[model samples]
Target: ALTLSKDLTASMSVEEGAALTLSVTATGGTGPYTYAWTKDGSPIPDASGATYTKPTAAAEDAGSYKVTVTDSKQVSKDSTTCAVTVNPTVPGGLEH
Candidate 1:
């Protein structure tokens, strides 16, 4: 059965300049699955895999991310949104 996960996953927070990774697992589907990641319903270039890693995160990275898995049988399903909040890099070592 081809189905998409729409669970409300807890949003993650990451500091700027840090790595941000998004991954998804497939179940009840054929093997050799293909993945395509998206941000705010827009396809991300070269983002075709079960996992996506951003070596260095930026302020712009703060957004909802999701992946679409396509099984060998051509059955496609979209995963739940993985919200990420990238905290801006503060200067002067300032913190309250």
Candidate 2:
């Protein structure tokens, strides 16, 4: 059983291309383990491993991210949903 910190979250500033660091802490794990990162309920290609460093995300990359943890014994657990936000500025506001 692994528990991620409540502070586990990700955020990025307004930019064409920027990198965001998302972290998850766990307790009640021993030996080796694996982690799978997902976006918008879709699993990333070949993104299964422990502690991940995601690449630069674009505007369309905004979504929620979650992970599936697998322990040394092959036991698995799903982490809580983590919100991911991309701060890309809008072009302009409507003037009426």
Candidate 3:
């Protein structure tokens, strides 16, 4: 088992009903990094990649999204928690 490092401390905000994506990078680990994403501290289904994408985010989508990386050697590390704020959209599809 080896040690791994990751950092995705950056936060993001998007308008409701809009698309959003979150990406992360890993270092100091073995080859072939695996990624797992979570929303509001809960695991997200089928969200296993360096980048996590949401086709459309609703007001309820606002939450803390985080990722964890695992190396080929089985060593894993969790990235810094990041906020994914989904701003409420106004009528007529305007985000203000």
Candidate 4:
């Protein structure tokens, strides 16, 4: 049987109003992998790609995100939840 594993890039926190991107990598699976991302257990529209990007980060964007990778063999794997904390950006700097 084929085994599959998925891993997400680490990004514990991000600055508000800054562009943020989250990505996942897959291993031990067949070629040509597809991706699906979710935020707080809900699908993010048009987020069916290896990388999920946001033009501008916001406080509300802080949450747990996950991704699923599917291989050409029809096998699939789910990555561990990745937490993202959006720190509010102030006039001076930023605040977590």
Clashing pairs in 1: none
lDDT of 3 by residue, 1-96 (tens): 122253443456666654546665544346756766677843443665565666666666677766667876887766656566667554455543
- After superposing all C-alphas onto the true structure, candidate 2 shows an RMSD in angstroms of 5.4
Model 2 spans > 4 angstroms off: 1-3, 6-19, 22-30, 41-46, 91-96
Question: In model 2, what lDDT does residue 79 have?
Answer: 66
Quote model 4's TM-score.
0.54
- Backbone clashes, each candidate: 0, 1, 0, 0
Model 2 agreement with the true structure over 1-96: per-residue lDDT tens digits: 234545234444444444544455444455554566677644443454444554666656666666767775768767655445554565454322
Q: What Cα-based lDDT does every candidate model obtain? A: 0.60, 0.54, 0.60, 0.59
> With candidate 2 superimposed using the best TM-score fit, by how many Å does residue 64's alpha carbon deviate from the native?
0.7
Whole-model lDDT for model 1 versus the true structure?
Answer: 0.60
Runs in model 3 lying further than 4 Å from the true structure? 1-9, 13-19, 25-30, 41-45, 89-96
Model 4 pairs in collision = none
Instruction: Please report how far candidate 1 places residue 84 from its true position, in Å.
Output: 0.8
CA lDDT, candidate 2, residue 55: 64
Which candidate do you rate higher for lDDT, 2 or 3? 3
Lowest summed-lDDT stretch of 10 residues in model 3? 1-10
**Residue 45, candidate 4: alpha-carbon lDDT:** 33
What would the per-residue lDDT of candidate 4 be over residues 1-96, giving only the tens digit for each residue? 122353443446666643445665444345756766676633343666565676665676667766677876887767656566666554465542
